[PDB]
């Protein structure tokens, strides 16, 4: 519902979505063979499925191909200072892909706008939607469209005849935030195939024991997971598959 979306939000009015109460894997996302921007700092793709955070956010805004690099925190420009500001200690990265098929018609696609004029530096993780008339002269502007009074929002020309660097790219940015609260969303763990009748070790949610796995004839009550004996040693464990 975020990637394969029917419509895409504007640059200034980027949609924010929070996902939780589930698990999220990045292996299928990596092997899609359609994303040309996956440079990430701080975390690693190999260790992304091991550690996790309290919550994961998602941001949706479509830009050109020249501004996908501008989303890095150490960047300046009309997008990196007036549209989206990323902190230096930001955890996560930016996912972008080519969207030549969509977000374009026969004529100029003027359905997307972005901020162009601002009197102050934007705060990190802040979105501004202002429809006030921008002023540059000393005389105040009472909402008129005269000299030194222009709309801050500038239209984007998403023509199909533009170059690769000017092609509109659909950009989805994930946000990783870890707090002291217990984690609600994490990564799914591995599920290796069991090996019976062989001296193997396992991690069955409560122990790390080495031994063969033999089929038994005693059945468990449907509320127990462990199993003891006379000598108080674990020798009967239920496989949750």
């Amino acid at each position: 519902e975020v990637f394969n979306a029917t419509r895409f939000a504007s640059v200034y009015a980027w949609n924010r979505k929070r996902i939780s109460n589930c698990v999220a894997d990045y292996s299928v996302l990596y092997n899609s063979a359609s994303f040309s921007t996956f440079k990430c700092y701080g975390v690693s793709p190999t260790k992304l499925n091991d550690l996790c955070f309290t919550n994961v956010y998602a941001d949706s805004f479509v830009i050109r191909g020249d501004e996908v690099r501008q989303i890095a925190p150490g960047q300046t420009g009309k997008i990196a200072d007036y549209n989206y500001k990323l902190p230096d200690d930001f955890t996560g990265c930016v996912i972008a892909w080519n969207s030549n098929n969509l977000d374009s018609k026969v004529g100029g696609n003027y359905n997307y706008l972005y901020r162009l004029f601002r009197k102050s530096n934007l705060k990190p993780f802040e979105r501004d939607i202002s429809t006030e008339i921008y002023q540059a002269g000393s005389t105040p502007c009472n909402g008129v469209e005269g000299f030194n009074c222009y709309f801050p929002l500038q239209s984007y020309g998403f023509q199909p005849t533009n170059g690769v660097g000017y092609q509109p790219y659909r950009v989805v940015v994930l946000s990783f935030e870890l707090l002291h609260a217990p984690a609600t969303v994490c990564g799914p763990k591995k599920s290796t195939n069991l090996v019976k009748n062989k001296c193997v070790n396992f991690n069955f949610n409560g122990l790390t024991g080495t031994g063969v796995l033999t089929e038994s004839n005693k059945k468990f009550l449907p509320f127990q997971q462990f199993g003891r004996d006379i000598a108080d040693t674990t020798d009967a464990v239920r496989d949750p598959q």
Partner: antibody
């Protein structure tokens, strides 16, 4: 300023309803213009909004490509068009004016409201 | 819709009535704030509160709201005869890519 709309209108189930929302005491300035309907016994739905200073529109996902909304900067009026009328569409419409701000929230709040247009369908 | 509101509420002229508007995490639980609107039965709806902390001109000081987690709450200092009106909560929806209103509640104080 205050905004004025059209009067009561009655039509056929399958015609096109045409309404407008005019501005008195001033133009729309640079603030966006949106329309919000209200049905008896139900909530208020949002169908789309118009940028009067750029002449562009942003619709909603619930409403498909049957409604075109435009704005004219010469007369400072809101132009609304709806087609393929249905017996369900017995709601009244108001023209909303949004006043944004800079902050963490960035949620559009409707500042000014129109008088309201009564539209009903009868075979 | 995606926003859930109580169907009706009751109160007395002199007590405190709290109305809570809860929704999904995409709109209410995200970074967007909430906006309250009051619609009397016979007049056009009007703005009441934006930004969850500020108040407009002409709005009495008895109208105060608070935001806590994935819900929005309101504090009312006494109910008057003119308070008999529908109450709605509006917030920006990321999945819908547009504004969505609440289910609506009825505050009837009469005898």
């Amino acid at each position: 300023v205050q905004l004025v709309e059209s009067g009561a209108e009655v039509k056929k189930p399958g015609s096109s309803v045409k309404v407008s929302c005019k501005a008195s005491g001033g133009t729309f300035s640079s603030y966006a213009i949106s329309w919000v309907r209200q049905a008896p016994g139900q909530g208020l739905e949002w169908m789309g909004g118009i940028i009067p200073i750029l002449g562009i529109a942003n619709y909603a996902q619930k409403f498909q490509g049957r409604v075109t909304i435009t704005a004219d900067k010469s007369t400072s009026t809101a132009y609304m068009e709806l087609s393929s009328l249905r017996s369900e569409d017995t709601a009244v419409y108001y023209c909303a004016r949004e006043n944004g701000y800079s902050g963490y929230g960035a949620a559009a709040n409707f500042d000014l409201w129109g008088r309201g247009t009564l539209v009903t369908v009868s075979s | 819709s995606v926003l859930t509101q109580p169907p009706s509420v009751s109160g007395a002229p002199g007590q405190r009535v709290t109305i809570s508007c809860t929704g999904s995490s995409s709109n209410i639980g995200a970074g967007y704030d909430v906006h309250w609107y009051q619609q009397l039965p016979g007049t056009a709806p009007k703005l009441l509160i934006y930004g969850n902390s500020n108040r407009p001109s002409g709005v009495p000081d008895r109208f105060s709201g608070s935001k806590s987690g994935t819900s929005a709450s309101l504090a009312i200092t006494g109910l008057q005869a003119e308070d008999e009106a529908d109450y709605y909560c509006q917030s920006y929806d990321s999945s819908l890519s547009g504004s969505v209103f609440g289910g609506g509640t009825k505050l009837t104080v009469l005898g």
